[PDB]
Design a protein around this ligand. Structure first.
Ligand SMILES: Oc1c(F)cc(F)cc1[C@H]1CCNN1
Ligand SMILES: [Cl-]
Ligand SMILES: [Cl-]
Ligand SMILES: [Cl-]
Ligand SMILES: [Cl-]
Ligand SMILES: [Mn+2]
Length: 340
């Protein structure tokens, strides 16, 4: 009952349906050469589901020391146990509370740390790397991944993968906050949604998630994946073409000045990783600068391909475990060159 692919974002986004189809490159490479992001669905069906549960991470690693971020105000919670994060992932009555008694929104910072994923979790590492889509691009030694083949005239990505773990944003005020603020990377990346935790306690929180997707500018086919197929939505992305990055910098310098920030005329608001483009800012970008983006809802098992140089931001709808691998495609190697 499956086709090779379909379109999202009104024809502007390729969606591949079979993550292990040996002919995916033939559809992928034209969209990719044009600087577009790409979605691949179904990767969860390829993985060992018991390796990707929050309860297993808490049991195996719960005594490690970590720092957390309060997503609502960017405050750092220093030197707590990683079980203090995992045990509140889905069960809200266990979640650390603010001084005022609210269940907090928390991101687990840099865990596993640096390049340690493979050493700490060798079985997770194997399960992910063996099941990544477009493997000639995405595997450490794929024929179309230049990462291991480039001289020092190019910025090379760290050894991955990297895990991205954070709770869902909850309230109407939370609609304007990012999980990961607007930034860009000089390498390509593939980001896989390996687990979505839809809570209980303040369970009945479904309604604010629909208003967020709608105001997020999501297309009508993406709204159908909820109501028709009952797939689990993880996170709302906005991605912008690499060619539009300077126009985005101009908007954010004008807004920083309007808000009384005192910045030099050359400072880089995208590198600062301090902005989240809310509905007001995304409309201003379109109307005042002529820039359109891609609004993407990443469901359980969706792999998002983010092109080198493309500004992007992430807003978790529910609690998410994401795992990402950097790579260097020949199509986009210009973005990591250190001259001209
Ligand atoms: O994966 C499938 C599949 F399950 C069914 C089909 F009719 C076509 C494909 C595509 C994918 C890329 N090229 N073959
Ligand atoms: Cl490009
Ligand atoms: Cl492991
Ligand atoms: Cl491939
Ligand atoms: Cl961030
Ligand atoms: Mn990134």
């Amino acid at each position: 009952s499956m086709t090779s692919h379909s379109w999202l974002c009104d024809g502007r986004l390729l969606c591949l349906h079979d993550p292990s189809n040996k002919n995916n490159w033939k559809i992928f490479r034209e969209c990719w050469k044009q600087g577009q992001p790409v979605l691949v669905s179904g990767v969860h069906k390829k993985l060992k589901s018991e390796l990707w549960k929050p309860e297993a991470f808490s049991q195996e690693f719960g005594d490690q020391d970590v720092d957390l971020v309060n997503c609502r105000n960017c405050a750092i919670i220093s030197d707590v146990k990683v079980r203090d994060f995992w045990d509140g992932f889905e069960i809200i009555c266990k979640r650390l509370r603010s001084e005022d008694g609210q269940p907090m929104v928390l991101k687990l910072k840099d865990w596993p740390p640096g390049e340690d994923f493979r050493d700490m979790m060798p079985t997770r590492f194997e399960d992910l790397m063996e099941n990544l889509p477009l493997p000639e691009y995405t595997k450490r030694d794929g024929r179309l991944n230049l990462a291991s083949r480039l001289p020092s005239y190019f910025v090379r990505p760290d050894l991955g993968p990297k895990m991205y773990n954070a709770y869902g944003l909850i309230t109407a005020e939370d609609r304007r906050v990012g999980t990961t603020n607007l930034h860009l990377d000089v390498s390509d990346a593939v980001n896989v949604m390996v687990y979505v935790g839809i809570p209980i306690g303040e369970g009945a929180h479904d309604e604010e998630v629909l208003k967020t997707i709608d105001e997020g500018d999501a297309d009508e086919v993406t709204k159908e994946r909820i109501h028709d197929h009952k797939e689990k939505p993880g996170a709302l992305w906005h991605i912008y073409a690499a060619k539009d990055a300077e126009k985005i910098r101009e908007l954010l310098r004008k807004v920083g000045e309007e808000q009384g920030q005192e910045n030099p005329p050359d400072h880089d608001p995208i590198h600062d990783q301090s902005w989240y483009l809310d509905q007001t800012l995304r409309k201003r970008l379109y109307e005042e600068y002529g820039v359109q983006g891609w609004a993407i809802v990443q469901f359980l098992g969706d792999a998002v391909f983010i092109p080198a140089g493309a500004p992007h931001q992430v807003h978790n709808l529910y609690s998410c475990i994401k795992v990402a691998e950097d790579f260097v495609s020949p199509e986009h190697v210009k973005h990591c060159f250190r001259l001209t």
